[PDB]
Amino acid sequence: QMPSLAPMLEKVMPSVVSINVEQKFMALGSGVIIDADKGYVVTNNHVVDNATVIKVQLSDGRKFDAKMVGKDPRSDIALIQIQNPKNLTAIKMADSDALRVGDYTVAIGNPFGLGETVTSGIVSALGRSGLNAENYENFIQTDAAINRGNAGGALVNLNGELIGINTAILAPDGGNIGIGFAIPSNMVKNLTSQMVEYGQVKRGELGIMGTELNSELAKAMKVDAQRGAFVSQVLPNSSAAKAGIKAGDVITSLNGKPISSFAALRAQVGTMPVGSKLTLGLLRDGKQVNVNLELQQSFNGIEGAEMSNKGKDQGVVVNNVKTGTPAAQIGLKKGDVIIGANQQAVKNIAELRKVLDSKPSVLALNIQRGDSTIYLLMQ
Amino acid sequence: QMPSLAPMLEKVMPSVVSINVEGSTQKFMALGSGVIIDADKGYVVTNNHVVDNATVIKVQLSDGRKFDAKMVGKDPRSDIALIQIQNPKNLTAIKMADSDALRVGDYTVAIGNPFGLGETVTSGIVSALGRSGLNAENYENFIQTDAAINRGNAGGALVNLNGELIGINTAILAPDGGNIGIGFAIPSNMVKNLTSQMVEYGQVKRGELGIMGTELNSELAKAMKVDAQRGAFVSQVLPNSSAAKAGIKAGDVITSLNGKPISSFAALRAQVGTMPVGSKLTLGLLRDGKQVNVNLELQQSVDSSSIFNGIEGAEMSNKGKDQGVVVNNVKTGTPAAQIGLKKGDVIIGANQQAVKNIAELRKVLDSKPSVLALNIQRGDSTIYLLMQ
Amino acid sequence: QMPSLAPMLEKVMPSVVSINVEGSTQKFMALGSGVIIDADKGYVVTNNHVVDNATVIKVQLSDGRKFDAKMVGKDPRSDIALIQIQNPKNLTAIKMADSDALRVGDYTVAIGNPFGLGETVTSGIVSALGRSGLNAENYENFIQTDAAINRGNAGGALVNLNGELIGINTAILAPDGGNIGIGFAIPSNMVKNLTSQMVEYGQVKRGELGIMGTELNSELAKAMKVDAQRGAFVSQVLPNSSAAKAGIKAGDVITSLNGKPISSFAALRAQVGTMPVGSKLTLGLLRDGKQVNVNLELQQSSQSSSIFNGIEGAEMSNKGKDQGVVVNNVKTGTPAAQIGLKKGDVIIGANQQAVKNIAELRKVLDSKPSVLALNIQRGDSTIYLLMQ
Amino acid sequence: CYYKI
Amino acid sequence: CYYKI
Amino acid sequence: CYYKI
Amino acid sequence: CYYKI
Amino acid sequence: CYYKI
């Protein structure tokens, strides 16, 4: 009585696909089914970017036509949707925060377009980053065989639960040398569930700057931990400024789960939707500090000018004007009052909008600045 | 207490041998691995691309004993050869399990000799099955494994966790010549069927059923409104073939053989490309959404390069009852038409001796004369042709 | 509930460190890995080529704690170094296992810092034992594995499933510099014997047995009518040697070491080429086809960067009875001819302070002034040499 | 393309 | 290495 | 295409 | 064809 | 060639 992965795999392999996408080029990659009914397939962005035609081939051979749903190249995640799905098999996703270095992994993909290829390995390490200092990267590293074409494929645990999406290998020659990286499933969950609900990735920010924490900085700042996030500075009017996070603080944990590095921490919340409440574990002056937070974004404010109504149907008064804005090109200044536009009088932000809803090629605004009555022009 | 593979390998590694070959073409020497099939007789299967053009062949066991081995059979369409150890004394044979029981996910142990380092055991799993396309003319129903395999593993055994032979490691895909986790092995059932043919007759009785076809993709099954999205699609059946005798219509899809599902046409072609003439087998079909089962039996099946090696584009054969070698058709600019062989020529003789058939022709060919002088005839004319 | 290596790794992962070193030759930087042997003293074993020409050695743990490490002992003949962590504060060392009980097919786990990525864990199996020939003069008895090993794993750990160190990852056979599934690591017993010498002496007590030999191949086996196809072939024994006192005659074939069979003579040279002087051992011989055992006891053999740490090419020791620091033999173009040194030179003084031995010699190397004045002699001639 | 058997 | 989050 | 070990 | 990492 | 121990 021998062991084998075949039972687990014959349940999972129908859920991993191969993708064909077409200075004209032809490309090949892999994808994994997220929703059985809607035909959603997750895949790497560098596979279906600049795609005119997207053909998906299932495990049985059935070809399908797919089109784009969402994309986020900062994390190299893209979601496509099979058109007219018939009898599709979704995969079961696991929480990658339960992963541990040494757990056995199985990678599924289409290396060199050969067809679905299954490869085995272990969790080589976790939390790896740095291969593109501006990309959101929190890779699972694995010694499982992964080559050109395995991108967008499935990295699953021994129960078949999806733990990550194979993305890139470290290889001086373009062929696997036992170092493959996969985006953890939890980032795929937060990213794809946004591409469905919003179409793109609603990016939130906390308003803190920081650098990594080395064993050399731990000495100078009387800090105990040797790896984390060092709060250099917090922007005012930011969630952290509001939450009372001061400079020189050190972020040790996130929601209980400790942090491995700033670059991992940056990539985690880079995938969280705006408004995602969370809790952080700080460390200032040798005191353990917990803090709750709320992401934010980076009347009818149009093109960088905040405006509301003035008087009883007396038009729309501009309230602020950011310099170097579309508003600055138009010349409008804070305190300016609109009476009408395009020979139509404006009483409130509704009548303004119904001319903006009419979408004209040029916009002539009948404002009054100070004592004078002038016109402004747009578009 | 630890789990391991050592107790299985200690019974299996004496079975795998390292091979050394000396040849000439620019003289060459090659190294690889081999697998003892029969213990008493000394049959050692290896890759044909390992032992071709070999003048001297010495086989070294796991313990370092050297032996001398003689070629017995070769089959390059599937890349399996067979050699026989001289004076076999105290060898170990390998049990061969049914490769058709393999599934994607099973664990594999690769044994070979990379770079002459010695017997190297590596670990992997069945990555995929039924793979073909490396050399689209070859009979390849390869097993795919991420077991580490580099230059020299060829002819080495691929075994399950019980040490039973499940495939002979053949080739890898490497854009840099070093293993990147992709190895290919010929299933043990194809080796079992091709080794058993070289034991009886020394070469292969390449049997033909008599159906033409091509792969069944997902687009063709939509056009043919057939359920299955993979199998063998019968484009046509040849007349006077045993397959045609059995009741096979064109447009039918083949789905199983001996009950075993079919991964692809090129796999099915490779599976039966090994079985000897007359092998009875069962087939599962799908014509008009109906299942059809039928049993069958092989029938028997010529270039100038099938008589010369190097002279293509001139299809020839015998003529009448010992009336010379007739030239049936010749293509322009082919290695025969460059010397003067035209279509219809009746090869009458060569070097002052009569040529009545492909047999009497080969009596002086193998006598290897320096310059050759055919006495063919272009109809009523009597002409001569020269070579070398 | 899934099988995993994580429960074992979380015990052993702290024991493996990464090693960052800066030096010069032309300044450079490089990195490998190390393993904590004594968590109390701060002993980290690594490869000697990781720490060759090293001015500053920094060790970074699993958790990111930076430390400082000074050299202890080096042995480039077997590429084992040993360093001690400055300020050992709350470490955990790895326990070791007996490599002589290793079997081909046992599962292995490699831990190292490939490409400075941090502590990476990779799984594989024992591919083969007793591997050598990759540098004939070095004492190599390597273990082979298909576990992923690349630049930075050097000096890293190779453990079994119980978490016990069985080998130190040393080098790979990669045609392109990237792991193709073939890695070599120095066995544990070899590292234990070498490190345990470096703790006492900071050097390796190189003992010899006094035999000449070559590899027993199958061809020579027939020549001498010897049944064993591999082992050590005794060519001659030296007079006054323990091997002679043990009664070993030329033409005897060694087959076992303390019971443990021999994979090759090259493995045997490395095995006892590491056992400290005086280590009593037994041997399995084979003369006239009759098995013979014999008990033995290694004796002394009596033989600059060992002392200089960077300026090599010339071996040097003490001279006579309190006669200074003699120079045995020098290689050309090395840093030894960069200063004005030949064979036979005897360093008697330095900076107006005499030098009776290497302990009196390094007693001024400690002073580290801006300028060095070596008061050497060549023949009856007394000269000085200046550096830095 | 096509292939025979 | 002074990114923003 | 492929290589032949 | 050799590499000492 | 020959070796020494």
Residue numbers in the entry:
A (entry chain F): 11 to 32, 82 to 357, 368 to 448
B (entry chain D): 11 to 35, 82 to 357, 362 to 448
C (entry chain E): 11 to 35, 82 to 359, 364 to 448
D (entry chain P), E (entry chain R), H (entry chain Q): 471 to 475
F (entry chain J), G (entry chain K): 460 to 464
From the manuscript:
First, DegP is an allosteric protease, whose activity is carefully regulated, and a hyperactive DegP variant kills bacteria. Second, because DegP is an inherently promiscuous protease that degrades misfolded proteins, over-activated DegP may destroy various proteins that mediate essential processes in the bacterial envelope, such as cell wall maintenance, membrane construction, or cell division. Previous report showed that substrate binding accompanies several allosteric behaviors of DegP: proteolytic activation, assembly of cage-like proteolytic chamber and positively cooperative binding of a substrate. DegP mainly degrades misfolded proteins, but its over-activation by the tripodal compounds triggers excessive degradation of newly synthesized proteins and leads to bacterial death.
We also tested the tripodal compound with the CYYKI arms (TMB_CYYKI). As expected, we obtained a similar biphasic curve with the maximal activation at around 10 µM, suggesting that this compound interacts with DegP more tightly than TMB_CYRKL (black circle). Alanine scanning of the peptide showed that the C-terminal isoleucine and two tyrosines are critical for the activation and tight binding of DegP. Denatured OmpA was degraded not by DegP alone, but by TMB_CYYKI-activated DegP, indicating that the compound induces degradation of a protein that is not efficiently recognized and degraded by DegP. By contrast, TMB_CYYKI functions as a permanent activator; it remained almost intact and still activated DegP after longer incubation times (1–4 h) with DegP. Overall DegP structures were almost identical to that of the dodecameric DegP with an active conformation (rmsd 0.697 Å and 0.986 Å, respectively, for 2309 Cα atoms in six DegP subunits). Additional electron density maps were found at positions where two degrons of 18–58 are present in the dodecamer model. Because CYRKL and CYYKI have hydrophobic C-terminal residues that can occupy both the S1 pocket of the active site and the hydrophobic pocket of PDZ1, we believe that these peptides are located in the two substrate-binding sites in the same fashion as two degrons of 18–58. Although the lack of electron density for the central benzene ring hampers determination of the binding mode, we suggest that only one arm of the tripodal compounds in the co-crystal structures binds to either substrate-binding sites of DegP, because the distances between two cysteine-Cα atoms in the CYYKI peptides of the crystal structure are too long to justify any of the three plausible modes for the bi- or tri-partite interactions. Taken together, the crystal structures suggest that the tripodal compounds mainly bind to the substrate-binding sites of DegP.
